[PDB]
Write a protein that binds this ligand. Structure first.
Ligand SMILES: Cc1cc2nc3c(=O)[nH]c(=O)nc-3n(C[C@H](O)[C@H](O)[C@H](O)COP(=O)(O)O)c2cc1C
Ligand SMILES: Cc1cc2nc3c(=O)[nH]c(=O)nc-3n(C[C@H](O)[C@H](O)[C@H](O)COP(=O)(O)O)c2cc1C
Ligand SMILES: O=C(O)c1cccnc1
Ligand SMILES: O=C(O)c1cccnc1
Lengths: 216, 216
């Protein structure tokens, strides 16, 4: 049951390098990334999934120097996911999304398709022209994906840790993301915790609902 | 089976007003809100849970103007959750979080507690003093919570729809959020879909992994 999952999941502080995702699990984590919801189904994201030693080493370059504590997590986990946001919402992407919805049979008529496209452009233009927050808006959808992913992987019986503790400039440069139109936001190592994971045995802590939650 | 949940969940376009959350479900959705992870366990959020006719009507004020299509969703769902972010990360909140971790037994020594506080302040100060993006940083954690919540509620067998299509100024004013130190970001009606939910029967559409996903 999902509440048990939410109450028992934790941020893993150390991974067992010998314990790999099964082939099926490796496919399932990709499914989770793909099928996250997003505003206007804008899907303003790219994922780097590192599963080779070479690949994980490249991601771990972002943790060198000041973020060194993050390196072992990135190197010892089975699979490491880099969540990236688009840096601009371009017309090519908008067309890609609506054309895909059309290919998947979501529109009964050309008018319905046109209306969907118009609505998505309205929202996108509002963020870029009026709110001046389009980069932030897209990054928010990526964080939503991350939240979906963390619960999803826990429910698959996998350990994980979300990481903001890395140098995004280094990671962006390593994978040439800027030129491709993306920027790295969160790194999520996924695998199985080791006996050295001190956080596996500690009680969860959250503020009480009397502070955070109002019922009306 | 969480993958089945992810593949089958959808954004509900119309709710059956007669179909209420069970008492236990109403508690479980609150648990999901509370137990979401966040960077440094900063939990920079407040939730309004509207379950009365009066309460939902107050939220539905925000579906004015361009956002009229959101009104029925907000009024007809069993429970409506307003996800809010803090407007600034203050020292009182940082102390609240570490003191709660201490009360929950996460620190073996005063030194461990002090180290946790120091680490949290380092990260928080980076955002508020250097990047001047603490508002954005906090809003990102809230969107992560939303992602967790949407999958969680689906796994409970509940329908939902995330909504950016509302007037945050109207909502903030209605609940006096600004003065309390919060701002509304996403509204999530939760309940059961009606036969009028045209999105319940439509195929789900996502961009292919050959565009969005790189394996290394
Ligand atoms: C942050 C966010 C905001 C959304 N806002 C709205 C909204 O205002 N109205 C609406 O009908 N759908 C809204 N949606 C639903 C999206 O259109 C939907 O998630 C997307 O088309 C993918 O479809 P699915 O959720 O059925 O998988 C929102 C989704 C997200 C993630
Ligand atoms: C966006 C985000 C970034 C995080 N970055 C790190 C990190 O860099 N290093 C780390 O050890 N934990 C990191 N965490 C884990 C949090 O400390 C953790 O989620 C929080 O303390 C709650 O504990 P739990 O995840 O075990 O429930 C991050 C969490 C989130 C949501
Ligand atoms: O996804 C949608 O349908 C949507 C998102 C934002 C605002 N209005 C609609
Ligand atoms: O939650 C953490 O431990 C954390 C968050 C951001 C950066 N470094 C650590």
């Amino acid at each position: 049951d999902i509440i048990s999952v939410a109450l028992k999941r934790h941020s893993t502080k150390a991974f067992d390098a010998s314990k790999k995702l099964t082939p099926e699990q490796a496919e399932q984590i990709k499914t989770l990334l793909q099928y996250s919801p997003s505003s206007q189904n804008s899907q303003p994201w790219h994922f780097i999934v590192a599963s080779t030693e070479e690949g994980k080493a490249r991601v771990a370059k972002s943790a060198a120097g000041n973020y060194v504590f993050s390196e072992r997590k990135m190197l010892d986990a089975s699979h490491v996911v880099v969540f990236c946001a688009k840096t601009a919402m371009d017309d090519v992407w908008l067309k890609l999304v609506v054309d895909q919805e059309d290919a998947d049979g979501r529109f009964a008529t050309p008018e319905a398709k046109a209306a969907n496209d118009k609505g998505r452009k309205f929202t996108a233009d509002m963020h870029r022209k009026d709110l001046h927050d389009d980069a932030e808006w897209m990054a928010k959808q990526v964080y939503l994906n991350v939240g979906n992913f963390l619960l999803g992987v826990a429910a698959l019986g996998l350990d994980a840790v979300p990481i903001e503790g890395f140098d995004a400039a280094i990671l962006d440069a390593e994978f040439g993301l800027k030129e491709k139109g993306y920027t790295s936001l969160v790194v999520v190592p996924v695998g199985h915790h080791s006996v050295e994971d001190f956080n596996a045995t500690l009680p969860k802590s959250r503020l009480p609902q009397n502070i955070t939650l109002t019922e009306v």
